[PDB]
Amino acid sequence: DSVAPGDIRYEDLRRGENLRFVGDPEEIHLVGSAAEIEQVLSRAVRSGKRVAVRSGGHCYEDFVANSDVRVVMDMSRLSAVGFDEERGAFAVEAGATLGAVYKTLFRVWGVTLPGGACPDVGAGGHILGGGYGPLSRMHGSIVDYLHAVEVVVVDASGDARTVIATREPSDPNHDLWWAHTGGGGGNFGVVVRYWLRTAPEPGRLLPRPPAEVLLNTTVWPWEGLDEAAFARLVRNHGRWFEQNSGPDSPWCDLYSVLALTRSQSGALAMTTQLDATGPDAEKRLETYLAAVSEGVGVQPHSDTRRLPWLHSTRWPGIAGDGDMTGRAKIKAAYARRSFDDRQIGTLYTRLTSTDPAGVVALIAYGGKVNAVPADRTAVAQRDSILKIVYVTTWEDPAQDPVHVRWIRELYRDVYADTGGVPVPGGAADGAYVNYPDVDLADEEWNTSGVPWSELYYKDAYPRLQAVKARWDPRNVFRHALSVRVPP
Amino acid sequence: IDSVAPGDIRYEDLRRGENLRFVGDPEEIHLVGSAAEIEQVLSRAVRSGKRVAVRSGGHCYEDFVANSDVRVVMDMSRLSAVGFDEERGAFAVEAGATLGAVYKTLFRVWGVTLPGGACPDVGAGGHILGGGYGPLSRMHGSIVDYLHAVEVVVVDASGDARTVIATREPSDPNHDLWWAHTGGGGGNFGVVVRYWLRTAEPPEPGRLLPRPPAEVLLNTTVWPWEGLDEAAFARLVRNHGRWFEQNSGPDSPWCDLYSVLALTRSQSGALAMTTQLDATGPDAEKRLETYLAAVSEGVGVQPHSDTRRLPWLHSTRWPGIAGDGDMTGRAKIKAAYARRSFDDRQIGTLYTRLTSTDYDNAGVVALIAYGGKVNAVPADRTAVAQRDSILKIVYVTTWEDPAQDPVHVRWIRELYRDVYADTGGVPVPGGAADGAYVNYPDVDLADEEWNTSGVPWSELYYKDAYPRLQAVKARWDPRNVFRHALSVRVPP
Ligand SMILES: *Cc1cc2c(nc3c(=O)[nH]c(=O)nc-3n2C[C@H](O)[C@H](O)[C@H](O)COP(=O)(O)OP(=O)(O)OC[C@H]2O[C@@H](n3cnc4c(N)ncnc43)[C@H](O)[C@@H]2O)c(*)c1C
Ligand SMILES: *Cc1cc2c(nc3c(=O)[nH]c(=O)nc-3n2C[C@H](O)[C@H](O)[C@H](O)COP(=O)(O)OP(=O)(O)OC[C@H]2O[C@@H](n3cnc4c(N)ncnc43)[C@H](O)[C@@H]2O)c(*)c1C
Ligand SMILES: CC1=CC(=O)[C@H]2O[C@]1(C)O[C@H]([C@H](C)/C=C(C)/C=C/C(O)=C1\C(=O)CNC1=O)[C@H]2C
Ligand SMILES: CC1=C[C@H](O)[C@H]2O[C@]1(C)O[C@H]([C@H](C)/C=C(C)/C=C/C(O)=C1\C(=O)CNC1=O)[C@H]2C
Ligand SMILES: [Cl-]
Ligand SMILES: [Cl-]
């Protein structure tokens, strides 16, 4: 159907899962096929009305709900996951949530994709932004399994058409397939479905997860934590990840997130997942936990459970708490090395100061992600060890400026020696387009002289611009931080 | 053909539901893709003498599916479609669909909903035929009040399986079987493949199920346990009880409010309440405030109160309503229907057992708003017989260490027994309580050591509906292929 203001569904469908952003579309179309997408597109382009696509609605920025967007194509009716006998690959429609993808692939076929934690995320935005997750160190990015994609595009004359692009070098649309391996949503056209398989039995055509995992939750009380203690914990963790994130590391089967929380929360915490298949799994876990707490002087509460693998993906310790109400602002960076002492000092001061819920999360990364050449996909960061996510959440819709400023100042200060942004090719490797932050393109917050596009895409940017020029010459698909041809 | 045996990578997940207390030993778990595949699993299991069980959403609070004696499981995961069936004129929900997919698909696509559970992960398979209710029940009734027809694979005396359709039409030959699916409970009559749902009351899908409110007010209210004595606790409980006694009739304007009051262990630091109210009237905020003021009056403890206004579909995924999604760890649940609110001795026992330092160190008694339009339905019209209650009361304890089951099971057994001590330790129907709800099953209701009331488990769950359920059992499952603790069973 089509949803317009006044329809009972309008208040829900005008929003994604980020409540800071309220869309004003004149029409939201729950499209049912490529053919219906082509008709909504060609009609919007003729009218001069700006469009956007919503799949899972997890965009951290206002790309879909931007007040200029007059027409939304919502992919909820296209949520199938299955094996496509004709193409010999798994077909994930854009509106499928990760929880549905993982349940279907694993229960029916015993396989999985190494995408996000977070069952409510849609495939649409997630895959073509370079999705990664708990199994990425073991199995790479989800885009490392992208075999082909179906996408509705608009030509110079304004007519919409459906094309298939694939990983085969001789594919005439090969360049468009490459741009879907991390190029980001909302840039090239409307993805209808992705086809994924390893680069003819379905059970053999995607990776098999561990049957069981050890999951641990470790908590340090903040009350008895001084700066030196905090700094040793952070340095322990960063040194361990600097040593143990290569593509041939035995530690490819470990994932963890260390949460550096505001002191007012009462505790810092870390969640770890380790493949439990080996009979020494428990010893290996403890050696990782011991490394993180060595010399800290605070004993953590520690609890470890063995869980079947599909059950573990729904545990809020990995999946997050599912609460998408209230208001949040995210920033993020790639880390090639962990923070230096001065940055640790900044973190400690900003986390303990009574100047607000807020966390800096360090998410294990690298491993098999890093076996891929930096230019093979549009995910150009293939030597990092951690993704660092800065977050502040609040409730009062009248108090956005103060929370945005807190997180802006923290991030600027951490990256102050590189113009306030994580400039690639140093201790940092730029930014991740599925954690978009419009401040990276803001002269007031980015003083590095490096454009937002090089921070997200590094050297992939020129190729993406060429794909943009070829496949979206009219620039129908745009938003803050969208791939844009040279002026 | 899609089957999982020990040694398969999928076996550890598929041998369990969402209750980690219960580890199954089936020789095969079949991921059935159709009614015909269910018939071939059933007929083979019957000719072998192998005990069967069905798993849809995996949310069973008891060991009905994962019982070690179950040899063959039919897992309905592949049967998860939700859509409109034009030819039937009703919405079709396959048993493997989760409530989250149900509400998303019905609402986004058609702007309608079903007044079923809170809890997006629950499967339709067990949830509807147990009499599912939720946030919207006071406004729209139980989900079974929209069950028009069912498709179910059943086994006859000779041991052959077939697929039948049973509908709400009085002249339908299978009308009795339809009736038993409006609250008879899972794992009793045969394998439901799909449910068809529509208002009993124009043939547009957008008018054939109730529309939810477009927006709701949602409130979380928290009272610190620190400055809270027995008199203050008792006043809060009594306030809430009286309000529900007065405001839960089928014609009450308060049919559009739902709330959960959590009487937590004092160890937890705070008592809390979540309230949802239809926000579309222009005085919704003043109405919410009057309900909150009634709950807190003269309590002497100022609650911390947070109200947000949310679009309806978004509200159903807020953990304040949906729960926190954490099904790891171990839990024991007991429950009862309340026709009137707790008396002095009961409030006293709750206070004592919520503040006591005994056992080990979690627990909660949650009072869930009920009644409203549920109670407009005659008690014998469906297999949900409790049609005059005002609250469902759920007793819970949770823990992590799998070596510590007894102390936790004992805590909650003694708390519940003590609350219902004046009636043999169990909520005997037709008094202050109205028995128990089959989607919150508790095997201790059939245990002579915990039920000294003289009233059998079957009358507690089903009241006068039981002999009719038994007649359906005799006719449709004569071999008793479908059984578990607390399964409908013909007379000896
Ligand atoms: C909210 C949330 C996000 C998470 C979570 N966990 C993650 C994880 O463990 N690893 C990750 O890599 N990412 C995680 N993320 C982030 C998500 O990956 C991003 O928020 C994704 O971009 C979201 O995808 P989706 O849910 O589909 O978001 P939308 O808002 O619909 O779209 C985002 C963006 O992409 C464009 N787009 C959507 N659909 C299409 C199609 N079919 N074709 C082209 N472009 C599309 C949109 O217009 C928009 O620009 C955990 C949580 C809780
Ligand atoms: C875990 C959980 C349960 C909840 C939650 N919230 C509820 C709410 O707000 N209102 C409710 O009324 N109930 C809520 N519940 C309880 C569920 O309603 C019950 O736990 C349901 O019985 C669960 O159904 P399902 O998830 O399908 O569980 P299973 O364990 O697969 O089945 C239970 C029972 O039913 C039999 N059965 C399943 N499938 C079939 C079919 N197709 N045909 C016949 N019989 C079937 C099973 O064999 C078993 O006997 C919130 C949470 C978080
Ligand atoms: C591990 C992980 C990876 C992800 O990629 C995302 O999911 C996880 C669980 O966590 C990531 C990050 C550490 C956490 C975030 C941002 C917390 C968000 C939050 O609390 C709220 C809102 O977004 C709206 N209202 C809220 O309350 C995040 C980026
Ligand atoms: C409001 C609800 C209605 C539903 O009928 C169910 O959902 C809701 C959200 O709350 C109910 C009850 C108050 C809470 C329970 C059982 C908590 C369970 C719980 O914590 C756990 C488990 O069940 C397993 N591990 C765990 O940790 C429950 C019966
Ligand atoms: Cl934008
Ligand atoms: Cl049983």
Ligand SMILES: [Mg+2]
């Ligand atoms: Mg949050």
Ligand SMILES: [Mg+2]
């Ligand atoms: Mg819990």
